Amino acid sequence: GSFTYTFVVRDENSTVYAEVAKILLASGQWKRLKRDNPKFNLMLGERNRLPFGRLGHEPGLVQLVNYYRGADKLCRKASLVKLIKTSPELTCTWFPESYVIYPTDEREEFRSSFNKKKENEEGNVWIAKSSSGILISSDATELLDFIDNQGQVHVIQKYLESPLLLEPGHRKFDIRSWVLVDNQYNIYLYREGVLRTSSEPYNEMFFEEFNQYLVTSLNINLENSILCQIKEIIRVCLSCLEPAISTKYLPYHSFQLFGFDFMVDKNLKVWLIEVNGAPACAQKLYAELCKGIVDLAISSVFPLNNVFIKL
Ligand X SMILES: Nc1ncnc2c1ncn2[C@@H]1O[C@H](COP(=O)(O)OP(=O)(O)NP(=O)(O)O)[C@@H](O)[C@H]1O
Interface contacts to ligand X, rule CB under 6 A: 96, 127, 129, 134, 157, 159-160, 174, 261, 263, 273-274
Q: Please count the other Cβ atoms lying within 10 Å of the Cβ belonging to residue 163.
A: 16
Cα 293 from Cα 277, distance rounded (Å): 15
Summarize the chain as % helix, strand, coil (round to 5): 30, 20, 50
Please identify, using beta-carbon distances, which residue of 127 and 234 lies nearer to ligand X.
127
Using Cβ positions, the residue closest to ligand X within the complex turns out to be 160
Of these partners, Mg ion, ligand X, none, which one is at the site of residue 256 (CB under 5 to 8 Å by kind)? Mg ion
Provide the minimum distance between the beta carbon of 38 and ligand X in the complex, in angstroms, as a whole number: 34
Cα 237 from Cα 278, distance rounded (Å): 17
Residue 188 annotated as lining a ligand binding site: no
Please identify, using beta-carbon distances, which residue of 20 and 263 lies nearer to ligand X.
263
Provide the minimum distance between the beta carbon of 50 and Mg ion in the complex, in angstroms, as a whole number: 9
> Please, which residues have CB within 8 angstroms of residue 298's CB and are 6 or more apart in sequence?
20, 24, 42, 64, 255
| Cα→Cα distances 152→47, 100, 104, 110, 191, Å | 20, 11, 9, 18, 36
Of these partners, Mg ion, ligand X, none, which one is at the site of residue 113 (CB under 5 to 8 Å by kind)? none
Residue 286 annotated as lining a ligand binding site: no
Provide the minimum distance between the beta carbon of 257 and Mg ion in the complex, in angstroms, as a whole number: 4
Residue 66 annotated as lining a ligand binding site: yes
Binding site for Mg ion (CB under 5 A): 66, 68-69, 254, 256-257
Residue 22 near residue 286 (C-beta atoms within 8 A) = no
Residue 129 near residue 154 (C-beta atoms within 8 A) = yes
Residue 5 annotated as lining a ligand binding site: no
Provide the minimum distance between the beta carbon of 177 and ligand X in the complex, in angstroms, as a whole number: 14
Cα 181 from Cα 191, distance rounded (Å): 15
Of these partners, Mg ion, ligand X, none, which one is at the site of residue 273 (CB under 5 to 8 Å by kind)? ligand X
Of these partners, Mg ion, ligand X, none, which one is at the site of residue 143 (CB under 5 to 8 Å by kind)? none
Please identify, using beta-carbon distances, which residue of 15 and 224 lies nearer to Mg ion.
15
Residue 17 annotated as lining a ligand binding site: yes
The length of the chain, given as a count of residues: 311
Please identify, using beta-carbon distances, which residue of 157 and 225 lies nearer to ligand X.
157
Strands 187-190 and 175-181: antiparallel
Of these partners, Mg ion, ligand X, none, which one is at the site of residue 56 (CB under 5 to 8 Å by kind)? none
Q: Residue ranges for the binding site for Mg(2+)?
A: 17, 45, 66, 252
